């Protein structure tokens, strides 16, 4: 039962400073080391350090000695990660893992990793379009549909068809930024005598601008 | 300062196909480890030290190697398998290796495309995205472009491109054309034209405003 839940995305300044934590369960948290992991958009992965919560000592990578900054709490069995002097280089996707030390450590826990946005845009909510055929698909024995969710910030949003329903024939795509806004697609294609015989809506989630679309695409 | 190159960075295999990963490291070292990352989640542990199996690992993988190489093999490539192997330095500064993506090998399918013109939603607020997908295709490589009354259109497009699907193991294209309903109405005809390498002939949608 080890676990390892890090805390939600994050949208800092430039120059600010964050603090993600890494809550730990199902094991000694004083008995293990936790260490940190960092992964830019798009790449490679990058180990940062590790904090001895038995101790509170702490050992980094020498790049990101005064960068980051590892602390523990023992009472909530919790690992802490201070960045400072934010750039567009940190922003990445963070992860806490607790390792077990055999012939050397072994990461066998990871937790879920924490999302870090550094930019100085403000959070702003998606206009969600319907994407509906123009009559010319039809040929097609199946039919595609979807919805264009376009200028939000931060990442991430969320989208299900129909609630979930629909799932198979679903394509999100990556979202692209421009102009410092988000804009990303989502198709679902379904067989000619499923739409608009039926109901087919896609379902939209913004968590940063508390954001909650349900868009019914109609011919 | 130790460097660990992985090979191939990219590779299609098709299902029941053995395997084999690299990892080669600048300079000996004593042991190695592996990970599996799929898409949006953490990376897992794969292989310990060399070649101990980590949790949740089917026994088709195997590790070996030893100084400045190392790999992993699948001795029957499943479609669960498919995913991106990190390899690791088991030591300070536990150094990653650049990765390899690892995909599933299917035969070859032409992109279906699909044309969207700008919502009335969209319009009434002033705005006029159009919008294709070219969806389910195999291999990965695509082209895209795009044509207002019949010329290109350079620059101003944003494309995004989904990785293997988990059911069909094809690839997918949306490749958005943002203008003000202005612009929009400015022209009649718009074309969204698709190059496959399983045609030279280019699939085009299109349609006109009016």
């Known amino acids: 039962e080890v676990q390892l839940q890090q805390s939600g995305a994050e949208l800092a300044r430039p120059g600010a400073s964050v603090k993600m934590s890494c809550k730990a369960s199902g094991y000694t948290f004083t008995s293990y080391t936790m260490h940190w992991v960092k992964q830019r958009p798009g790449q490679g992965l990058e180990w940062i350090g590790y904090?001895?919560?038995?101790?509170?000592?702490?050992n980094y990578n020498q790049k990101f000695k005064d960068k980051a900054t590892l602390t523990a709490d023992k009472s909530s069995s919790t690992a802490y990660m201070q960045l400072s002097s934010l750039t567009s280089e940190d922003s990445a996707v963070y992860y806490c893992s607790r390792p077990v030390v055999r012939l050397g450590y072994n990461f066998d826990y990871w937790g879920q990793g924490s999302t870090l946005t550094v930019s100085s845009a403000k959070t702003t909510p998606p206009s969600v379009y319907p994407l509906a055929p123009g009559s010319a698909a039809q040929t097609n024995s199946m039919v595609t549909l979807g919805c264009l969710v376009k200028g939000y910030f931060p990442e991430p949003v969320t989208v299900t068809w129909n609630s979930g329903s629909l799932s198979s024939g679903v394509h999100t795509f990556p979202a692209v930024l421009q102009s410092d806004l988000y804009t990303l697609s989502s198709s679902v294609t379904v067989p000619s005598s499923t739409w608009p015989s039926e109901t087919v809506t896609c379902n939209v989630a913004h968590p940063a601008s508390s954001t909650k679309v349900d868009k019914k695409i109609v011919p | 300062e130790i460097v660990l190159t992985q090979s191939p960075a990219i590779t299609a295999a098709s299902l029941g196909q053995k395997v084999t990963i690299t990892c080669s490291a600048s300079s000996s070292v004593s042991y190695m480890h592996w990970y599996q990352q799929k898409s949006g989640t953490s990376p897992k542990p794969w292989i310990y030290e060399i070649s101990k199996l980590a949790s949740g690992v089917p026994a088709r993988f195997s590790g070996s190697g030893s100084g400045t190489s190392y790999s992993l093999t699948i001795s029957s490539m499943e479609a669960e398998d498919a995913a991106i192997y990190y390899c690791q330095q088991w030591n300070y500064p536990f150094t990653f290796g650049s990765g390899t993506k690892l995909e599933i090998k299917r035969a070859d399918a032409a992109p279906t495309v699909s044309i969207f013109p700008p919502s009335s939603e969209q319009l009434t607020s002033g705005g006029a995205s159009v919008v294709c997908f070219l969806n389910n295709f195999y291999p990965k490589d695509i082209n895209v472009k795009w044509k207002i009354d019949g010329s290109e259109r350079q620059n101003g497009v944003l494309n995004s491109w989904t990785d293997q699907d988990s059911k069909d193991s094809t690839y997918s294209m949306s490749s958005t054309l943002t203008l003000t309903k202005d612009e929009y109405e400015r022209h009649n005809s718009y074309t969204c034209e698709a190059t496959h390498k399983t045609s030279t002939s280019p699939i085009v949608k299109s349609f006109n405003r009016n």
């Open positions: 904090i001895n919560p038995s101790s509170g000592y702490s």
